[model samples]
Target chain A: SKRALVILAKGAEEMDTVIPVDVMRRAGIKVTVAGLAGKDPVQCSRDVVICPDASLEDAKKEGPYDVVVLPGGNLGAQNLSESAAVKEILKEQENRKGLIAAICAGPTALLAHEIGFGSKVTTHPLAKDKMMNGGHYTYSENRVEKDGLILTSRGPGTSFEFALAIVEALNGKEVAAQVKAPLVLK
Target chain B: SKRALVILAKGAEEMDTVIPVDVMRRAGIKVTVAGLAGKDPVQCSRDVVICPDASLEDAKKEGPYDVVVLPGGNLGAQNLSESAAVKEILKEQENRKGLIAAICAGPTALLAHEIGFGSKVTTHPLAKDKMMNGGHYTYSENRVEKDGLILTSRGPGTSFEFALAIVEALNGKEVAAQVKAPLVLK
Candidate 1:
């Protein structure tokens, strides 16, 4: 089945994590909101607990999803980067050539694990040095960057466009159009 | 509490139904996936079964949510329009001046229920005739459109833009940016 897994953590930045994942699902991709094991329901970094659909262990067992999306928050990305389960998911993303898409510091999570090494990517400019040293980098609108199965985008203002780029990448242009044309993006 | 009620039925286009509701939740809005009674797990057009948070009838009895979002799907839109509970929800949306957001065919449900009458609204191109006859209308290409109490958009392609727009409208652009920045939208 075509599916996308969104990693959740305590202290996840509100916009970084939720918007793109929701947008991907809205692009007609199946979305599973999964939290890391033993994670609290209410981890308010920017002020709010994001209700997760299932635990990471539960979601891991439910795989082979078509895509795995990592949303970036300050420490949330750090937490996700450290998860052994996330490491394995990353390995799978590489092996299958599936889209391992991330945003802001999200690509850092993958970088920390050394998953998408040499794959072209982007992230919050703060992480540019870190992302570049770990993987390939490209500067476009610097809005979103997709190289092979790995994709990355800049930051908050770019979240929707980042998310839209993923939809176009994974679900195809027509599906993306279903959501985009209304927004006036050609 | 701020909340969004989404349309769900068999063969729902996944992105339209899921993304907006998910985005609302990300914005810290309490969101309930509502459908007709007896429909416990609502599947999308692509075949993912999403467990409804509440039945439509129960949601109505509970009363008072801030927003009602309609996600687009061909047959699902028709089913929503025919639903007595959905009609009640739309009526309440009008009376409360709640945010009534719809995308793609989901907007057809509003027109069918008379919420579109005299209201300037937008939807997928195929439904334009119905939108024109159903209410005051404008041709919009923006990912998310707000006309008075109504918010409309195209469909699938704009999922990310749509969700981010919701965050911008409900919260502030800064909050939306905080969310999008990590993902690299800003």
Candidate 2:
């Protein structure tokens, strides 16, 4: 059994946020959707409102997590990147060699926190420049890129692929395949 | 400007609900996520709790919308199928020749409402038998099927295609293409 921590912030991309949270749960991974802005409901970029399971402050104390996931939106990623709380959690995960997964603009937060430098990664095409700032990590355009313990993906379209990769890494190929089937992925 | 109403009920698939709402908004469509059980938060099938923009009772007063969208989970679909309010909404949309779209088990709600009996449609493979009860409608295996104003799609994997099809129908091909590009759809 494994646990995952998905950080949710204001203006987060709800599609990117919900897909992994749903898919990971389908794979039998215990997932905690932690809100960055206290315990209040978060309004995503497109105006979808989601209530978190716990505030990041509360969820952090329950760690260390098997994987730390960051969902992306221009504003959400900025909130993630600017947070000292997020920096500490990401750094702690990296120090222990746990998995760190980000999608779309989320990988830019990785750059901001200075975690996973030198790992080849991908991000939403619009976020490529922000993610490539200073060229710290090697750039990748793969739909889903995983190098070592760091995993990254493109945008909402790649979310299922991005999530299934997380499943395979944590639960093995068989469980991943089993979960993928019911989703009816094209 | 076009407006869409997405019915969010207990046990609805959050992925299917959120994707179309987000995508339609990207195409500049005003989307209202109306909770079937009033304005309180509804826990999705996978336990994702989403706060509704308004209660369906309130949203119903604002119709007729350009489209009525339904998201799918077994229980969510059943709730939608059994709702007098949902049936009234779907029937109104049908009477006005507005678009009615459902994905995965969502199409089963259309069946339960008896709103699109002769249209060709598709649903999640597992929901096929229930959707075909009495062979009231012809079935297709297409990921996204639109026969007249009745549009249907398969599972979570087909959500983007489903949403984009809605965009094309409500907006146009150009708007759908513009929305698709940014999503990094494969």
**Candidate whose DockQ is highest:** 2
Error of 2 at A144 (Å): 0.4
Candidate 1 structure quality by residue, lDDT tens digits, B127-163? 7776666235656655667777777888665655677
- How well is each residue in A69-90 modelled by candidate 1, as lDDT tens digits? 8877667788888888899998
Q: What is the TM-score of chain B in candidate 1?
A: 0.88
Docking class of 1: incorrect
Alpha-carbon shift of residue B176 in model 2 (angstroms): 0.4
**Docking class of predicted structure 2:** high
Give one digit per residue, the lDDT tens place, for model 2 in B53-137.
9999999999889999999999999999999999999998899999999999999999899988999999999999999999999
